[PDB]
Design a protein around this ligand. Sequence first.
Ligand SMILES: *[B]([O])([O])[C]([C][C]([C])[C])[N]C(=O)[C]([C]C1=[C][C]=[C][C]=[C]1)[N]C(=O)C1=N[C]=[C]N=[C]1
Length: 195
Amino acid sequence: ERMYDVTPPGVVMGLAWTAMGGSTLFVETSLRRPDGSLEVTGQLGEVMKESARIAYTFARAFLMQHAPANDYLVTSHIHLHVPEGATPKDGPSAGCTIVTALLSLAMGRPVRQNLAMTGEVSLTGKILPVGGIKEKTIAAKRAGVTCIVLPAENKKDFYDLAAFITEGLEVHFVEHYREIFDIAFPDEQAEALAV
Ligand SMILES: *[B]([O])([O])[C]([C][C]([C])[C])[N]C(=O)[C]([C]C1=[C][C]=[C][C]=[C]1)[N]C(=O)C1=N[C]=[C]N=[C]1
């Protein structure tokens, strides 16, 4: 089972691993009040806290180019949480997940359902390779993930898995956050008609 079968805005599924295997986790974000700020909870280590700062800065910049009239990330007091509360978590691979959670919250739009992602985020939005792709992918498949987004340089790790694991997985290998944004929010890049 999963902690969220259906993600509302501000909630994105990420992927973690330990020496004991892989798991899914959800990044949760929310307002704490009507210059902004980010408060972060979830027993995060120092690499993960820094990846939340990087993601926060990039998301502010990304959404000032995609939606300059939208100030929600610049002015709001945001809270970011990664359950479960007692479990320690660390590492950079949730960067894109955090970016997506913040944009999802600021746009008031949920991300594509049954989607998980992992990837380190650069300050300019480059997606850097991560560890545990095999364990994270198995965990996604067990959790009902149908769409998985991974750093492009982790492609060989993904295809080291047996076919019966990756069959049925729609996989996207990405290098810049813009590619994730268009998978996560397909209606922001979809064919439209005027009336
Ligand atoms: B990602 O690989 O950076 C990811 C980020 C986020 C999903 C937590 N981090 C991990 O998957 C961590 C989880 C963790 C758990 C407890 C304490 C620290 C980190 N795992 C690893 O970094 C890791 N797992 C197995 C073997 N080596 C390292």
